[PDB]
Design a protein around this ligand. Structure first.
Ligand SMILES: Nc1ccc(C#Cc2cccc(C(=O)Nc3cccc(C(F)(F)F)c3)c2)cn1
Length: 287
């Protein structure tokens, strides 16, 4: 347990599910960490959710998953301490880049990104998801808005919840029901509301689509929420009328066919993360 008195709060980094995240400095053995604390309006229910989030995160020990560095001492107000990811949100990060025209033509720091770097980003996500699958842990909300970027394009999977204003349009809300990220959801999750490792694979396919789009458009962006939900009914009925995300400009056909396998009607035909990682790290380099 880490004494709260060793922390110096510096700036607000954003909201989390049941708290708010601040950049902090630590003097003891100028190190920067990210610290989540309870929101100023926190109730008994928020505190309970916060304590359970600490327990969930203590399960997670992988280079491409966020890690809990410590918690505050029992007498202190509740805090969670994690790595400060210098480049922040992956969706906002990729939105600030464009695909390079000629390979290895720019100066260091140019706002461009290469096709092999897009594969490196997606491979790291697949490796973190492979790890969660070995714990039989189901994420339930994989998307670029829930991934973080550190130095040298290192990627960690995280989970900031479904209540942030910046991504409100990514969730479907009906009074009295669970909030749903429908444009990332497998057809069986839309229809029956339960989540599995195989539906995490489907969401990974959408996340991979996002990366190759450089986060320039929402999945199914020209269709309404109601049409996205009806599309799940067309997967169920299986009469060849369902529709899929289109091939991104940066995406060659061979990689697109892997994305299409993530969206198979049958869960067992979707590729495991071990095979998705191997394609992105090796086969995708082929000409
Ligand atoms: N620049 C920046 C900006 C923000 C941050 C941060 C942060 C932070 C703090 C506390 C908890 C979590 C979190 O992801 N919780 C969480 C809950 C359930 C499941 C999972 C799972 F890992 F499985 F995805 C993760 C993130 C760092 N650096």
């Amino acid at each position: 347990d880490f004494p709260r008195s060793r922390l110096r709060f510096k700036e607000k980094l954003g909201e989390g599910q049941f708290g708010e995240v601040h950049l902090c400095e630590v003097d003891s053995p100028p190190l920067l960490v990210a610290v989540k604390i309870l929101r100023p309006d926190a109730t008994k229910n928020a505190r309970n959710d916060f304590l359970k989030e600490v327990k969930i995160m203590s399960r997670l020990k992988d280079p491409n998953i966020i890690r809990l560095l410590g918690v505050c001492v029992q007498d202190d107000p509740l805090c969670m301490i994690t790595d400060y990811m210098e480049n922040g949100d992956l969706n906002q990060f990729l939105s600030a880049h464009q695909l390079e025209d000629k390979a290895a033509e720019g100066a260091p720091g140019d706002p461009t990104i290469s096709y092999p770097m897009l594969l490196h980003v997606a491979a790291q996500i697949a490796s973190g998801m492979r790890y969660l699958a070995t714990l039989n842990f189901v994420h339930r909300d994989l998307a670029t808005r829930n991934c973080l970027v550190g130095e040298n394009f290192t990627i960690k999977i995280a989970d900031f919840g479904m209540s942030r204003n910046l991504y409100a349009g990514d969730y479907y809300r009906v009074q009295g029901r669970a909030v749903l990220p429908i444009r990332w959801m497998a057809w069986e999750c839309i229809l029956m509301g339960k989540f599995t490792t195989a539906s995490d694979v489907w969401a990974f396919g959408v996340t991979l689509w996002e990366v190759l789009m450089l986060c320039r458009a929402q999945p199914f962006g020209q269709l309404t929420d109601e049409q996205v939900i009806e599309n799940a009914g067309e997967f169920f009925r299986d009469q060849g009328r369902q529709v899929y995300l289109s091939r991104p400009p940066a995406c060659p056909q061979g990689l697109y066919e892997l994305m299409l396998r993530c969206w198979s009607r049958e869960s067992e035909q979707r590729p495991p993360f071990s095979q998705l990682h191997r394609f992105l790290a090796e086969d995708a380099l082929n000409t």
